Amino acid sequence: MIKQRTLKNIIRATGVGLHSGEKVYLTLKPAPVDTGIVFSRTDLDPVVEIPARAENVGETTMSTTLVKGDVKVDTVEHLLSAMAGLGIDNAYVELSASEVPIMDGSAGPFVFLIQSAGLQEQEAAKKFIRIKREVSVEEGDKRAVFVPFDGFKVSFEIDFDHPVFRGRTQQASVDFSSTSFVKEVSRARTFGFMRDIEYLRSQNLALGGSVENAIVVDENRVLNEDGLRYEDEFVKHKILDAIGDLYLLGNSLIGEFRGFKSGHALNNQLLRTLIADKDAWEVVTFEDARTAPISYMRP
Numbered sequence: 001m002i003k004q005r006t007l008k009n010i011i012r013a014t015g016v017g018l019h020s021g022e023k024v025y026l027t028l029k030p031a032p033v034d035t036g037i038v039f040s041r042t043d044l045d046p047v048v049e050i051p052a053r054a055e056n057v058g059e060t061t062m063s064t065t066l067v068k069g070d071v072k073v074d075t076v077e078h079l080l081s082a083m084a085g086l087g088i089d090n091a092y093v094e095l096s097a098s099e100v101p102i103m104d105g106s107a108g109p110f111v112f113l114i115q116s117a118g119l120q121e122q123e124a125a126k127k128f129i130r131i132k133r134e135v136s137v138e139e140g141d142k143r144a145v146f147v148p149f150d151g152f153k154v155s156f157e158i159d160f161d162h163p164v165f166r167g168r169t170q171q172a173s174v175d176f177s178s179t180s181f182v183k184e185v186s187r188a189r190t191f192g193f194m195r196d197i198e199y200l201r202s203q204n205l206a207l208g209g210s211v212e213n214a215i216v217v218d219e220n221r222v223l224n225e226d227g228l229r230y231e232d233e234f235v236k237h238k239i240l241d242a243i244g245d246l247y248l249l250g251n252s253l254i255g256e257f258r259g260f261k262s263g264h265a266l267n268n269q270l271l272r273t274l275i276a277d278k279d280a281w282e283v284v285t286f287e288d289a290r291t292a293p294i295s296y297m298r299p
């Protein structure tokens with residue numbers, strides 16, 4: 001049987017918001033079966049809880065933001081990508097501020113902290129959303145698609161229109177039947193271009209962004225003295241973002257995602273279109289893990 005998973009132990013981390021630059025304390029806690037992933041603003045009295053679900057996404061400018069009335073949890077995509085990669089169904093995420101800490105810009109620190117704490121299998125069937133029909137959303141030259149697939153596969157393609165790529169459209173495919181999320185995706189850091197500094201300053205964004213927690217590009221130069229973690233780090237980070245954004249479905253996917261310049265906004269529009277088109281998907285469980293089209297690492 002493929003079982004639901006939670007954390008075996010609590011995880012505690014400190015860091016800064018990429019966008020806010022605020023110091024934030026993070027605690028991940030075990031949760032019961034069918035809780036899903038629930039963010040808690042514990043700096044507020046009373047505490048404000050926001051389920052990590054597509055319907056609670058409020059802003060998708062330069063991150064995925066959860067919103068309940070006036071309350072936000074910004075930049076959830078990198079932590080949710082870690083939780084999706086390791087198959088965590090149920091957890092409370094407590095935050096002392098409005099934004100998940102950026103850590104090193106990747107999902108690496110989160111997968112390491114989680115795998116250090118360990119996972120706990122729970123006595124309940126893991127529920128999957130199985131893609132049964134093709135579902136496409138487009139806006140301009142941006143496109144995001146779900147395709148039926150017996151497994152979980154992500155493709156991303158983007159023409160960054162930026163000199164640092166030396167005129168090359170970036171493309172990557174990962175199939176979690178062979179690709180290690182941990183080894184091949186989790187280390188891919190977020191990035192910023194020095195040419196967007198005017199605009200980011202003007203939206204009060206990326207206040208915590210530096211070479212410490214991101215790839216920083218200035219025209220031709222990667223400013224980071226120690227360089228890239230992957231030849232294709234930039235596009236592997238878009239795949240990491242897409243895995244986090246897709247986890248707002250609230251259950252792991254059986255299917256394929258293809259992204260064409262898609263961002264947080266179009267990723268969320270795809271989830272909403274999918275959820276509305278009930279002909280395109282069904283909830284499935286696997287009573288026997290041996291015949292399932294996906295597997296997870298030992299807990």
Ligand SMILES: COc1ccc(-c2cn(CC[C@](C)(C(=O)NO)S(C)(=O)=O)c(=O)o2)c(F)c1
Nearest residue numbers: 062063077190191192206209210211214216241
């Ligand atoms: C002075 O260093 C900087 C400046 C800006 C950033 C920066 C990062 N981001 C977030 C970038 C995006 C939206 C991302 O990772 N989302 O999860 S991406 C790479 O998909 O386009 C941003 O809006 O600004 C940075 F990381 C470092």
Ligand SMILES: [Zn+2]
Nearest residue numbers: 077078190241
């Ligand atoms: Zn990102």
